[PDB]
């Protein structure tokens, strides 16, 4: 049994991480302007 509140806060940060990687990619990728 894994406490729910931990499943969330872990899956939570995990999303802020991936979605944040996207936001970084906006200043480096092909979607850049440089």
């Amino acid at each position: 049994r894994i406490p729910l509140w931990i499943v969330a806060t872990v899956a939570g940060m995990g999303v802020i991480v991936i979605v944040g990687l996207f936001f970084y990619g906006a200043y480096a990728g092909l979607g850049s302007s440089l």
């Binding site: 406490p3 931990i6 806060t9 940060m13």
Partner: peptide, 28 residues
Amino acid sequence: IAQLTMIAMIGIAGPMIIFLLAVRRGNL
């Protein structure tokens, strides 16, 4: 270069100071 090292720790710090409390069970 990769100060993501910083964030990571101070990031898991927040949930930790309540997790240790779920262990030592008390005052939440």
